[PDB]
Amino acid sequence: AFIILDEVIKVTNRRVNAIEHVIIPRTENTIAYINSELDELDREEFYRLKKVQEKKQNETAKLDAEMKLK
């Protein structure tokens, strides 16, 4: 029982101190850093897309208003 309890307590302490305390930072990295950065890059790219689309449509609307005036 001493041998079994020592092995079991060692495994439990390892899980508490290294296994879980490394899986949690790994998950934290994955989601909070990288998924957020990928979503942020998608946000920036789609916002740049929207800016291009709006400036193009605004130029078209300005041209239409000008030829209506003329």
Binding site: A1, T12, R15, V16, A18, V22, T27, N35
Partner: protein, 51 residues
């Protein structure tokens, strides 16, 4: 910063590591109360040896 798995950050890997973390946490609690039972019996046996 801290120990790392150095794994491929994707949604599939995020879910994989969340499942792994939950499994490891429940295994830690499981072995903790197993060890509680074992050390209770161990203290009992130590008393038997002592007397």
């Amino acid at each position: 910063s801290g120990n790392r798995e150095q794994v491929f950050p994707t949604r599939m890997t995020l879910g994989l590591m969340k499942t792994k973390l939950k499994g490891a946490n429940q295994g830690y609690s499981l072995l903790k109360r197993k060890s509680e039972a074992l050390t209770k019996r161990f203290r009992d046996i130590t008393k038997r040896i002592d007397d």
